[PDB]
């Protein structure tokens, strides 16, 4: 189940300053970047164009170039109209794309000042329950733009899953890459033993403190942290009594290891 996410972040500091930057993810791998400074969408993989021809890509890109300017103008005009009741600074975030299932669903969510306020769903834009009531009229007005509604419906319902199926084909060797974890043990000089596991890909992993074959259910798994080389970092900690560290080991199972687990004895 791959989720394709286009993430747009727009900061409007005052009437004279704003920027919009985007990043695009297929699962946990970045496929695109679109800096405010750049006219064109940048590829972060050799396969970021999917199976689209250069001409098909330039058309899609062109649509987004027009959108980015229109969106920026629209927000600036809206703030002028609402002044002084709604005023700068303003953060708007969009999360849009599609989740690919075997044998898809799409989404477009919008947040204002860090809170989810608006989505596109079905054939229209809608404010979500609890969103500020001042958004209702601008959304009603946007909903009167049939051409925009038809374009968004196409992008979500059709363009997204098609583009993504091409990405999955074109990027298969990267998407299915296996990178092996390296592990190491530590503690501060009752103790907390820490098993560090770094450099694994893909994300699914099993890390457990063991005494022989017995899993120590006291094992607390940390958050998955990214390394800068598209691999993952995780630590698992165990609180133990002093003198009771002998016989403990950290065991790591991962798809890349071919059934040969890492076992590190304290």
């Amino acid at each position: 189940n791959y989720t394709f996410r286009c993430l747009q972040m727009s900061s409007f500091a005052n009437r004279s300053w704003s920027r919009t930057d985007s990043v695009v993810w297929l699962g946990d791998l970045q496929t695109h970047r679109w800096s405010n400074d750049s006219a064109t969408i940048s590829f972060t993989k050799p396969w970021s164009q999917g199976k689209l021809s250069n001409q098909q890509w330039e058309k899609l890109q062109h649509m987004f170039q027009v959108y980015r300017v229109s969106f920026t103008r629209d927000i600036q005009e809206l703030v002028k109209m609402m002044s002084p009741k709604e005023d700068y600074p303003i953060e708007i975030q969009l999360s849009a794309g599609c989740e690919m299932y075997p044998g898809s669903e799409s989404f477009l969510h919008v947040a204002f000042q860090g809170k989810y306020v608006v989505r596109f769903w079905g054939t229209s834009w809608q404010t979500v329950p609890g969103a500020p009531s001042w958004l209702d009229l601008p959304i009603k007005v946007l909903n009167a733009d049939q051409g925009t509604s038809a374009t968004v419906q196409m992008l979500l319902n059709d363009t997204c899953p098609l583009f993504v199926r091409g990405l999955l084909e074109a990027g298969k060797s990267d998407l299915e890459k296996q990178e092996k974890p390296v592990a190491w043990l530590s503690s501060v000089p009752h103790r907390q033993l820490v098993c560090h596991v770094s450099g694994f890909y893909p994300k699914p992993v099993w890390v457990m403190w063991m005494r022989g074959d017995q899993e120590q259910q006291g094992t607390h798994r940390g958050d998955f942290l990214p390394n800068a080389d598209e691999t993952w970092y995780l630590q698992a900690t165990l609180d133990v009594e002093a003198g009771e560290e002998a016989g403990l080991a950290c065991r790591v199972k991962h798809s890349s290891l071919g059934g040969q687990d890492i076992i590190l004895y304290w």
């Binding site: 993430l7 972040m9 930057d21 970045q30 560090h196």
Partner: protein, 98 residues
Amino acid sequence: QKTPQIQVYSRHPPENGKPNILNCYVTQFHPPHIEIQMLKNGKKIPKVEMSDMSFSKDWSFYILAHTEFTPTETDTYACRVKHASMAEPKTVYWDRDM
């Protein structure tokens, strides 16, 4: 509005005298404007690379900074973050194990 959380950890097992990569992962902040430095013995490290800023399902922003480093037992390393949510910059020292 939301205060950044800072985690500092190495790419490879930290072994004294061996080149490695130190990561500073900054998360759970809003607004997105932020200043991130990595420090060696309290002084700013020049070549620090940054990921593109992105955001999570909950809309909070995150970003990864990293730099080459060679741990020794005469050097400290840290990550220092300035953000509007905090009166003063927040510094988290590498705990020497992570």
